[PDB]
């Protein structure tokens, strides 16, 4: 939902997430940059970090 | 002395592809214009008739290593799209060697 | 509307439109330790 | 002194002008409507432009700088050489259709007033189009990355 | 005896025409492929040539079969072949080998007869199979009821329809339904499609009366803001009213062939045929608007993605796509369109 | 599976952001392609289709092409039936029973031309032979129909080939692996009918 | 000098800078003698802003008119 | 909202006889006059006033005055 809200109707996505109480795992590039975490690609994966 | 062996990233927007940002080793020159290598122009898609470049400075050791290895211009000869060489002789050079 | 002829942007008005988080973070922010300048052709330089 | 104009250009122009006159005469006869007349004239003049380009290519010596630059792959193309030393050819009206009457004069000779005015249409159209061209490209790129 | 020889001669000539037709298409395809690959000219010039060649290629393809309809002979004995394309002989002063049926010279093919001799000799008509000529000839009730039954669905109120609005007790008379029905029928769209016109006319007339009646003596000269907002507010409430919706359903409501057909008789080919007359109304396609908003919301981001003029680093300040196309046009650019 | 990284020339390294590279490679030459008309006034440009960005969009979005063409559901002998202005085709299986039929075809569209160099016949005629999924008209097939007739792998190959042909016809050179990476995201979901 | 004799197609009662794409900024065949068809800003205001020709004076009504030489026989 | 042209003609002070005597060239307008239901000039003014602003009471004097005020002042 964190990535979905980037390019979708934020209110609708947030409402659907809140009602479902589902959690987003931070696997990807769109959501990680928002959180400030280093991207899970290239040098940023756990294998090399 | 401090500037020695400190990579600096050069960028030319719009960055249509990853080669639009490349790391170079800076050397002090008197003036107001950034001197750019003639070969990388095709990678940046720029001509010296008023274009300007943006310069960014890595600080942390990880960032400096990243610029030195991954993003160094000397390590990005081939185009990631198809592998055809991208930093090759152009215009005058082609007229010369020909 | 308040003063003028424009609505007051409430909480959800934020992080929903062109402005506000979930947006304007994928548009571009300004950074320090950076500069801009015109370029000239340097034939004496090495590729690196 | 290096921009050489082929001597065969005049013959091609005269022959294709005669063919265009024949097309006009047939249009007057009622055997053609307006759109088909324009299409036939456009085809005739495109063929004339191709012939002039071929004559220019076969006339220029291999050591001439203008053709040497293009042939070595340094930059440019033979269409630009034809425009510079051959004939401009057909140009586009603002609506986007080819004007049946082409531009005979080469830029070396110098376009006349009316030829320059009709040529300005395509230049303005392209300079306006070049920016709008990137909108859909960026749209597709951001779809692809998303 | 000569019919077999005559047919063979006509077969050869039609083959001769196809020889030119195929040669022209091959030349166009080479030009079209070359223009796409290595035009070398300006972008406008590249597109203009490509469009003309692509348009020309399609023009030839459509005529690839049944190119000729027949040969016309005039008092001058000229061979005025009639076909789907205008083919001329460049080597012979562009002498027309085959005239187009739309050309003025090909006029007598349809407006000439022995009783109307527009300088026409024997006239021939070709019968063809594939790319070859086979032979030639020479010369010298319930459907109306179904629509009428459908029209009966668009009735009029027997007594004035009371809207019973929230604030003003609105009423709908037979004249409003009669006027509303007339506009719906004038458009010519099906009964399901004409509902939008009927609803718009009915809603507009009712809304105007309510807006003025409510503010009668209070909103007469204050047209600065109290002249259009109230109509929209009344429209929003009116469209949601249950009684108003039922009143519209009373006359000229949504109809189906099964319900309509049963009512007409109790008052297969018809069912399938009546479907086209019934059509569809796209009733409250809110989801489509959501997709429109989503696409429009997307494009505004796409335009914002691109470089702004705040910090430009080009040789000169050139025009940008943000100055030519807006989000709505960019969103509408990639619609289904089918 | 990915193969060597075109930038380095060796086997791709773990953690490589293949998706971003593929998207950027596809999008960078987008401006070099032919594009639909910008004239607001005039006539709709869809009919005068040009093989460029509109076609790339038509492929990637997995929409039904405007100028759709049919395909052969079952391999067998093809019988072509002429009519006043339309025409009908029927395929009788050589290793089966019932014969499939297509009847909405019209003479206004050229029939698919056999591209075999030595055959030289061109348009397929009566009594010819076709295989499953073979196209019967000149134009663009329907990806959904291809997926229905054949397996998921076949439709992916068809999409990759179509996009690569569109990009190559205009001089832009892009490796097939990027197109495959883009396409792979379109077959990652399975629709469930019943639980 | 060029600024003073400038023909703008925007402002109060004019066209927006984000509208009229390739429809009002095209060179109409009537510019000849009344509006220079080659010289115009390359920025956002391409086509919208032009310059008056050398031989041109505004009609009291407000229509740009140009001179011509009478030809008889 | 679309209205018959004959309604406007009658409002100005035209009648069926003059319309059918003068506008006898084009058949479309003949059809429009056939479809027209207004009989007299006064009804045309009243009809126009009702269609414009149904909310206000329809009277002949105000109907004429509004149309007179609309464009002829
Ligand atoms: Mg520049």
Domains of chain D from N-terminus onward: 1-114 (1.10.132.30)
E strand or H helix that includes residue B69 = helix B61-69
Question: Do residues A32 and A26 touch, judged by C-beta distance below 8 A?
Answer: yes
The encoded tokens of residue E8 equal 């063979």
Terminal alpha carbon distance of chain B: 41
The encoded tokens of residue E231 equal 């109509």
> Chain D closest CA to B8's CA: distance in Å?
27
Q: Establish if D94 touches chain G: CB-CB under 8 angstroms.
A: yes
Quick one: resolution in A?
Answer: 3.5
Exposure string of F124-157, with b = 16+ CB inside 10 Å and e = fewer, is: beeeeebeebbbbbebbbbbebbbebeeeeebbe
Question: Do residues F56 and F33 touch, judged by C-beta distance below 8 A?
Answer: yes
φ/ψ region of C2 (left if φ > 0, alpha if ψ in -120 to 50, else beta) reads: left
Residue contacts between C and E (CB atoms, under 8 Å): 10
CB atoms within 10 A of CB H11: 22
What would the DSSP string read from start to end of E119-184? Answer: SEEEEEEEEEETTEEEEEEEE--HHHHHHHHHHHTS---SS-EE---SSS--EE-HHHHHHHHHHH
Write down the experimental method used for this entry: cryo-EM
Q: Establish if B64 touches chain A: CB-CB under 8 angstroms.
A: no
Q: How far from H4 is each of H10, H35, H36, H59, CA to CA, in Å? A: 10, 8, 7, 20
Question: Do residues F88 and F107 touch, judged by C-beta distance below 8 A?
Answer: no
Taken as a whole, chain C contains a residue count of 48
C26 contacts on E by Cβ (under 8 Å) = 301, 305
Residue E32: partners with Cβ closer than 8 Å, 6 or more residues away: E50, E53, E54, E57
Exposure string of F40-79, with b = 16+ CB inside 10 Å and e = fewer, is: eeeeebeeebbbbbbbbbbbbeebebeeebbbbbbbbebe
Beta bridge partners of D89: D103
How far apart CA C41 and CA B34 sit, in angstroms, is 8
Q: How far from D112 is each of A19, D9, E100, G30, G42, CA to CA, in Å? A: 73, 18, 38, 17, 25
Is B92 known as a binding-site position?
Answer: no
Question: Do residues E256 and E171 touch, judged by C-beta distance below 8 A?
Answer: no
Q: What are phi and psi of E308, to 5 degrees?
A: -95, 165
How far apart CA B63 and CA B57 sit, in angstroms, is 9
How far apart CA E152 and CA E217 sit, in angstroms, is 42
Q: Establish if G23 touches chain F: CB-CB under 8 angstroms.
A: yes
Taking only Cα atoms into account, the Rg of chain F, rounded to an integer number of angstroms, comes to 20
Distance E299 CA to ligand 1 centre (A): 28
Beta bridge partners of C37: B53
What DSSP character marks residue E17? H
What would the DSSP string read from start to end of F61-122? Answer: TTPPPTTB--B-SS-EEEEEEE-SSBEEEEEE-TTSSS-EEE---BTTSPBPEE--TTT--E
E202: burial class by Cβ within 10 Å (0-12, 13-18, 19+)? Answer: buried
Taking only Cα atoms into account, the Rg of chain D, rounded to an integer number of angstroms, comes to 19
The encoded tokens of residue E156 equal 């009029």
Distance B68 CA to ligand 1 centre (A): 28
B66 contacts on A by Cβ (under 8 Å) = 43
Write down which chains contact chain C via at least 3 CB pairs under 8 A. Answer: A, B, E
Q: Establish if G38 touches chain F: CB-CB under 8 angstroms.
A: no
> Chain D closest CA to B91's CA: distance in Å?
4
How far apart CA F180 and CA F176 sit, in angstroms, is 6
Do residue C40 and residue B72 have CB atoms under 8 angstroms apart?
no
What DSSP character marks residue E308? P
How far apart CA D92 and CA C8 sit, in angstroms, is 51
Do residue E208 and residue H54 have CB atoms under 8 angstroms apart?
yes
Q: Of F161, F164, F160, nearest to F181 (Cα)?
A: F160
Which of A9, A10, A13 would you mutate first to test chain E, the one with the most E CBs within 10 A?
Answer: A9
How far apart CA E156 and CA E178 sit, in angstroms, is 7
> Chain A closest CA to B19's CA: distance in Å?
17
Question: Do residues B34 and C39 touch, judged by C-beta distance below 8 A?
Answer: yes
Q: Which residue has the tokens 């669905």?
A: E153
E270: burial class by Cβ within 10 Å (0-12, 13-18, 19+)? Answer: middle
How far apart CA A18 and CA E138 sit, in angstroms, is 82
E218: burial class by Cβ within 10 Å (0-12, 13-18, 19+)? Answer: exposed
How many C-alpha atoms does B5 have within 13 Å on its Cβ side?
2
Q: Establish if B16 touches chain F: CB-CB under 8 angstroms.
A: yes
Question: Do residues E264 and E149 touch, judged by C-beta distance below 8 A?
Answer: yes
Residue F191: partners with Cβ closer than 8 Å, 6 or more residues away: none
How far apart CA G19 and CA G7 sit, in angstroms, is 18
Question: Do residues D20 and D44 touch, judged by C-beta distance below 8 A?
Answer: yes
Taken as a whole, chain F contains a residue count of 195
E strand or H helix that includes residue B65 = helix B61-69
Helix count and strand count (H, E) for chain H: 5, 0
How far apart CA D103 and CA D118 sit, in angstroms, is 9
How many C-alpha atoms does D75 have within 13 Å on its Cβ side?
8
Do residue C23 and residue E301 have CB atoms under 8 angstroms apart?
yes
Question: Do residues E254 and E192 touch, judged by C-beta distance below 8 A?
Answer: yes
Residue ranges of the binding site of F for Zn(2+): 1
Q: Of F64, F139, F85, F82, nearest to E61 (Cα)?
A: F139
Q: How far from F93 is each of F73, F77, F87, CA to CA, in Å? A: 10, 6, 20
How far apart CA E292 and CA E328 sit, in angstroms, is 9
Question: Do residues E175 and E261 touch, judged by C-beta distance below 8 A?
Answer: no
Q: Of D28, D21, D18, D82, nearest to D54 (Cα)?
A: D82
Q: How far from F151 is each of E208, F91, F156, CA to CA, in Å? A: 60, 21, 9
How far apart CA E113 and CA B53 sit, in angstroms, is 79
Distance C43 CA to ligand 1 centre (A): 19
DSSP 3-state of B85: strand
The encoded tokens of residue H13 equal 């002070």
């Amino acid at each position: 939902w964190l990535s979905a809200a980037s390019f979708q109707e934020t209110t609708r996505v947030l409402t659907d997430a809140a009602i479902n109480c589902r959690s987003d795992k931070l696997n990807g590039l769109k959501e990680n940059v928002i959180i400030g975490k280093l991207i899970p690609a290239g040098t940023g994966i756990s294998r090399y970090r | 002395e401090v500037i020695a062996e400190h990579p600096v990233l050069l960028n030319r927007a719009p960055t249509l592809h990853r080669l639009g940002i490349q790391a170079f080793e800076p050397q002090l020159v008197e003036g107001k214009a950034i001197q750019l290598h003639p070969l990388v122009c095709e990678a940046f898609n720029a001509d010296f008739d008023g274009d300007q470049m943006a310069v960014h400075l890595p600080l942390s050791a990880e960032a400096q290593a990243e610029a030195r290895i991954l993003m160094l211009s000397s390590n990005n000869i081939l185009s990631p799209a198809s592998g055809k060489p991208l930093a090759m002789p152009r215009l005058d050079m082609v007229t010369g060697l020909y | 509307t308040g003063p003028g002829n424009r609505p007051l942007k409430s909480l959800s008005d934020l992080l929903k439109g062109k402005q506000g988080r979930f947006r304007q973070n994928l548009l571009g922010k300004r950074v320090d330790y950076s500069g801009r300048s015109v370029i000239v052709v340097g034939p004496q330089l090495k590729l690196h | 002194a290096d921009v050489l104009v082929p001597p065969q250009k005049q013959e091609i122009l005269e022959r294709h002008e005669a063919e265009a006159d024949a097309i006009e005469r047939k249009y007057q006869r009622g055997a053609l409507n307006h759109t088909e007349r324009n299409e036939s004239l456009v085809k005739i003049w495109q063929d004339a432009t191709e012939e002039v380009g071929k004559a220019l290519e076969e006339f220029y010596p291999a050591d001439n700088p203008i053709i040497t630059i293009v042939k070595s792959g340094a930059t440019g193309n033979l269409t630009q050489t034809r425009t510079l030393a051959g004939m401009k050819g057909l140009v586009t009206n603002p609506k986007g259709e080819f004007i049946p009457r082409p531009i005979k004069s080469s830029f070396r000779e110098g376009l006349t007033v009316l030829e320059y005015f009709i040529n300005t249409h395509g230049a303005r159209k392209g300079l306006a189009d070049t920016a709008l061209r990137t909108a859909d490209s960026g749209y597709l790129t951001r779809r692809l990355v998303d | 005896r000569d019919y077999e020889d005559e047919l063979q001669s006509e077969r050869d000539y039609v083959a001769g025409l196809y020889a030119r037709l195929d040669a022209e298409r091959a030349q166009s395809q080479r030009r079209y492929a070359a223009a796409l690959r290595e035009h070398g000219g300006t972008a406008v010039e590249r597109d203009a040539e490509v469009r003309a060649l692509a348009k020309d290629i399609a023009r030839l393809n459509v005529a690839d079969n049944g190119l000729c309809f027949g040969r016309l002979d005039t008092l001058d004995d000229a061979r005025l072949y009639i076909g789907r394309l205008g083919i001329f002989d460049r080597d012979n002063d562009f002498e027309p080998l085959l005239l187009d049926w739309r050309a003025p010279m090909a006029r007598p093919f349809y407006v000439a007869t022995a009783a109307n001799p527009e300088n026409m000799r024997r006239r021939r008509q070709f019968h063809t199979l594939g790319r070859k000529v086979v032979d030639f000839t020479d010369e010298i009730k319930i459907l109306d009821v179904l629509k009428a039954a459908v029209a009966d669905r668009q009735e009029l109120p027997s007594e004035p329809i009371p809207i019973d609005l929230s604030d003003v007790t609105m009423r709908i008379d037979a004249e409003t339904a009669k006027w509303a029905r007339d506009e719906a029928r004038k458009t010519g769209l099906p009964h399901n499609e004409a509902r939008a016109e009927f609803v718009d006319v009915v809603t507009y007339v009712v809304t105007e009366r309510a807006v003025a009646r409510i503010g009668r003596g209070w909103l007469t000269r204050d047209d600065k803001h109290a002249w259009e907002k109230m109509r929209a507010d009344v429209v929003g409430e009116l469209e949601d009213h249950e009684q108003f919706n039922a009143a519209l359903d009373a006359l000229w409501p949504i109809l189906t062939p099964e319900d309509v057909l049963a009512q007409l008789y109790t008052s297969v080919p018809l069912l399938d045929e009546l479907v086209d007359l019934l059509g569809r109304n796209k009733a409250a396609d809110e989801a489509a608007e959501r997709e429109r908003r989503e696409e429009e919301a997307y494009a505004a981001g796409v335009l914002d993605l691109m470089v702004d003029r705040e910090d430009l680093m080009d040789d000169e300040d050139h025009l940008l796509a943000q100055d030519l196309i807006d989000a709505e046009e960019l969103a509408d650019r990639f619609k289904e369109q089918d | 599976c990915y193969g060597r990284s075109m930038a380095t020339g060796k086997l791709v390294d773990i953690g490589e952001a293949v998706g971003i590279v593929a998207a950027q490679s596809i999008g960078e030459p987008g401006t070099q392609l032919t594009m639909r008309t910008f004239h607001q006034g005039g006539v709709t440009g869809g009919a005068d289709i040009v093989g460029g960005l509109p076609r790339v969009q038509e492929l990637f979005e997995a929409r039904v092409p405007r100028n759709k063409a049919p395909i052969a559901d079952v391999a067998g002998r093809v019988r072509l039936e002429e009519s006043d202005k339309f025409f009908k085709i029927t395929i009788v299986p050589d290793d089966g029973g019932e014969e499939v039929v297509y009847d909405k075809l019209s003479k206004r569209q050229r029939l698919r031309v056999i591209t075999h160099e030595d055959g030289t016949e061109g348009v397929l005629s009566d009594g010819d032979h076709v295989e499953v999924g073979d196209q019967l008209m000149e134009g663009a097939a329907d990806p959904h129909e291809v997926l229905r007739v054949q397996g998921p792998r076949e439709v992916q190959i068809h999409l990759v080939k179509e996009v690569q042909e569109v990009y190559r016809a205009q001089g832009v050179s892009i490796h097939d692996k990027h197109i495959e990476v883009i396409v792979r995201q379109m077959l990652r979901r399975v629709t469930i009918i019943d639980s | 000098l060029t600024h003073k004799r400038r023909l703008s197609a925007l402002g109060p009662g004019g066209l927006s800078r984000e509208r009229a794409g390739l429809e009002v900024r095209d060179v109409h065949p009537s510019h000849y003698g009344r509006m220079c068809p080659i010289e115009t800003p390359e920025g956002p205001n391409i086509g919208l802003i032009g310059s008056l020709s050398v031989y041109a004076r505004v009609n009291p009504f407000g229509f740009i008119e140009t001179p011509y030489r009478k030809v008889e026989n | 909202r679309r209205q018959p042209v004959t309604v406007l003609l009658k409002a100005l002070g035209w009648t069926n006889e003059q319309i059918v005597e003068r506008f006898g060239f084009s058949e479309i307008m003949m059809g429009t006059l056939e479809k027209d239901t207004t009989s007299g000039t006064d009804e045309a003014l009243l009809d126009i006033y009702r269609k414009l602003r149904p909310g206000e009471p329809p009277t002949k004097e105000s109907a004429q005055t509004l149309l007179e005020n609309l464009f002829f002042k």
